[PDB]
């Protein structure tokens, strides 16, 4: 019987505590609100060890990562409760068909301006440079906001067409990432120009922007609802308006639903539900918090209706309508981290915009960072790539909707390739074969259907026909599929591979420039199993995976 809640320092924690206090009054169990630094990164660490907060408050996008990691408990709330909050907020906090958090509030960056200093807010980004030069000649600046966090710079970047993950056919494609497109390069390019024109300074952080604006030294800032409190403290005449256009288009700011998740390890899930459902998520409760620091537009229809009266909230909503509510998938933290780095590198001059985004994009797209072993092996792992299988049909093998493993069917071609292709560089990935009777693992340059008919089913894989692969048969017989003699085209030359230990996991390493494809026995200290060398790479080449009608999954990595 206790509750520990974690919430950001930006947010109105004290207001929340007041809610905690009333909950304690009624039920006599203590509630503690803690607002620790970088709680978003800390939470997985502590929670996993068994001691983490019972309840955590953050924007929805992370929560997928948490949920996948199994740190979040599912929530059982009744149909009638669900009705009280908007269904789109619920969707934000839905992962793999399960609700993982309670939605609380909807937060969107707004353009905030000092009315006394500036009569009319800029409709366009492009006018702002002229304005700031006008303003400098009075010891003041046009615009200051946190450049360190990509949350604040994303809206401009997305304006002309930058995007994180392509959503199509009802699903986010983690591979189709638009950080490196024309639109994104255009947006970031404008910003770097502002910095090098001395209009804005690359170091400006949250505190700097906020201090400057509150002290009326800058005409504009960019921020969410939580910030309105401090500006009220400063007695500044301010408006909250729509973000300016870039290349004639709306700034598209990612929209967050502040959400309350329940630690999977919490002994007090039962208490947590009531607190959230019956105490916080009520007119009384949100008011408490909102009076401390503004929540934005709340999820609770009851109270939000009274909030919509505030013109500032309307402005928040207008910017949200122009933007996109964040994805909640696990890759969001890669996205963010990559963009965080690209922004500062470009603004500090340590990289060109075009570099920064190619860096950031490959980082997100392929090179995901998601001893006592063979040195070559550890070397190869340095180049490790994330791989998802591409569904192209039919081969009769089943693939998990995660696109990360494949097995056969009970009911003769079952063979599958990696979604992404290879034309340059070094790629490493691992495949879990454990507990499988048979399989073929290797690098496949394509089905090459119509190239010549046969290989798919009669299982002749020969480098000459573009298959560099090794195989398991009958539980303990391992083979390399080297290419055969001229007359014998149909059958591959099969070489007994001597493996001392059945590998539960195998590592495939492609150095495209080298024309080398190497196989490592992860189970057995990463020793080399086989290496195809001097192999013709005339074509893009993809990872190959064949269950070999095993009926047991081959999982990637």
Ligand X SMILES: OC[C@H]1O[C@H](O[C@H]2[C@H](O)[C@@H](O)[C@@H](O)O[C@@H]2CO)[C@H](O)[C@@H](O)[C@@H]1O
Binding site for ligand X (CB under 6 A): 8, 10, 40, 59, 61-62, 107, 149-151, 224, 256, 336
CB of 164 to ligand X, least distance (A): 11
CB of 289 to ligand X, least distance (A): 13
Beta-sheet strands, E only, within 264-345: 297-298, 324-325
Place of tokens 């930006």: 10
Beta-sheet strands, E only, within 119-206: 141-143, 163-168, 171-178
Broken C–N links (> 2.5 Å) in the chain, after residues: 370, 411
* Choice between 59 and 264, CB closer to ligand X: 59
CB of 296 to ligand X, least distance (A): 9
* Choice between 47 and 470, CB closer to ligand X: 47
CB of 40 to ligand X, least distance (A): 6
The C-alpha atoms of residue 496 and residue 483 are separated, in whole angstroms, by 13
* Choice between 224 and 466, CB closer to ligand X: 224
* Choice between 256 and 327, CB closer to ligand X: 256
CB of 438 to ligand X, least distance (A): 43
* Choice between 159 and 550, CB closer to ligand X: 159
β-strand partners of 259:
58, 103
CB of 313 to ligand X, least distance (A): 15
β-strand partners of 407:
398
The C-alpha atoms of residue 154 and residue 251 are separated, in whole angstroms, by 9
Tokens of 547: 């269950």
Q: Name residues whose C-beta falls within 8 Å of residue 352's C-beta, 6 or more positions apart in sequence.
A: 346
| Helix orientation angle between 13-27 and 283-292, rounded to the nearest 10 degrees | 140
Beta strand 324-325 pairing with 254-262: parallel
Cα within 13 Å of Cα(60), Cβ side: 29
The C-alpha atoms of residue 255 and residue 41 are separated, in whole angstroms, by 20
| Helix orientation angle between 182-196 and 150-159, rounded to the nearest 10 degrees | 120
220 to 124, 138, 200, 230, 449: CA distances (angstroms): 13, 15, 12, 15, 60
The enclosing H or E element of 375 equals helix 375-381
| Contact of 469 with 442, CB cutoff 8 Å | yes
| Nearest residue relative to ligand X (C-beta) | 59
* DSSP, res 124: B
CB of 263 to ligand X, least distance (A): 18
CB of 494 to ligand X, least distance (A): 51
CB of 443 to ligand X, least distance (A): 36
CB of 41 to ligand X, least distance (A): 8
For residue 227, the Cα-to-chain-centroid distance in whole angstroms is: 26
Burial 459-484 (b: 16+ CB within 10 A, else e): bbbbbebbbbbbbbeeeeebbbbbbb
* Choice between 336 and 384, CB closer to ligand X: 336
* Choice between 368 and 373, CB closer to ligand X: 368
* Choice between 92 and 271, CB closer to ligand X: 92
């Amino acid at each position: 019987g206790k509750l520990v809640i974690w919430i950001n320092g930006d947010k109105g924690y004290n207001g929340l505590a007041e809610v905690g206090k009333k909950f304690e009054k009624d039920t006599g169990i203590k509630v503690t609100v803690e607002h620790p630094d970088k709680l978003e990164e800390k939470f997985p660490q502590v929670a996993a060890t068994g001691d983490g907060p019972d309840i955590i408050f953050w924007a929805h996008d992370r929560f997928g990562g948490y949920a996948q990691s199994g740190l979040l408990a599912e929530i059982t709330p009744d149909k009638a409760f669900q009705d009280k909050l908007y269904p789109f907020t619920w969707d934000a906090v839905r992962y793999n068909g399960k609700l993982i958090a309670y939605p609380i509030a909807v937060e969107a960056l707004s353009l905030i301006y000092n009315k006394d200093l500036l009569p009319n807010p800029p409709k366009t980004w492009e006018e702002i440079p002229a304005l700031d030069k006008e303003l400098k000649a009075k010891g003041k600046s046009a615009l200051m906001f946190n450049l360190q966090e990509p949350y604040f710079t994303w809206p401009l970047i997305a304006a002309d067409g930058g995007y994180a993950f392509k959503y199509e056919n009802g699903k986010y494609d983690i591979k189709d990432v638009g950080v490196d497109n024309a639109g994104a390069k255009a947006g970031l390019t404008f910003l770097v120009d502002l910095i090098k024109n001395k209009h804005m300074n690359a170091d400006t952080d949250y505190s700097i922007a906020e201090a400057a604006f509150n002290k009326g030294e800058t005409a504009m800032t960019i921020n969410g609802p939580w910030a309105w409190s401090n500006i009220d403290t400063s007695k500044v005449n301010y408006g909250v308006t729509v973000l300016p256009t870039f290349k004639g288009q709306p700034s598209k700011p990612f929209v967050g639903v502040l959400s309350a998740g329940i630690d999977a390890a919490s002994p007090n899930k039962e208490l947590a539900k009531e607190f959230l459902e019956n105490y916080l998520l009520t007119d009384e409760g949100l008011e408490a918090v909102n009076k401390d620091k503004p929540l934005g537009a709340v999820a609770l229809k009851s109270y939000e209706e009274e909030l919509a009266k505030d013109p500032r909230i309307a402005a928040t909503m207008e910017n949200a309508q122009k933007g996109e509510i964040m994805p909640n998938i696990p890759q969001m933290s890669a996205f963010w981290y990559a963009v965080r780095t690209a922004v500062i590198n470009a603004a500090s001059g340590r990289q060109t915009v075009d570099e920064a985004l190619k860096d950031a994009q490959t980082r997100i797209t392929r090179r995901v960072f998601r001893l006592d072993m063979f040195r070559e092996l550890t070397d190869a792992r340095r180049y490790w790539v994330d791989v998802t299988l591409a569904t192209n049909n039919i081969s009769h093998a089943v693939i998990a909707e995660d696109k990360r493993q494949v097995s056969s069917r009970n009911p003769y071609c079952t063979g599958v390739l990696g979604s992404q292709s290879i034309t340059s560089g070094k790629h490493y990935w691992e495949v879990d074969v454990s507990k499988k009777s048979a399989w073929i693992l290797g690098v496949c340059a394509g089905f090459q259907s119509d190239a010549m008919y046969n290989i798919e089913q009669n299982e002749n894989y020969q480098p000459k026909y573009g298959y560099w692969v090794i195989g398991l048969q009958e539980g303990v017989k391992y083979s390399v599929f080297q290419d055969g003699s001229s007359h014998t085209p149909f059958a591959p030359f099969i070489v007994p591979l001597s493996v001392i230990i059945c590998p539960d996991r195998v590592g495939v390493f492609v150095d495209y420039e080298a024309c080398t494809v190497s196989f490592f026995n992860i189970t057995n200290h990463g020793f080399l199993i086989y290496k195809f060398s001097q192999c013709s790479f005339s074509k893009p080449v993809f990872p190959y995976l064949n269950p070999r009608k095993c009926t047991v999954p081959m999982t990637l990595c």
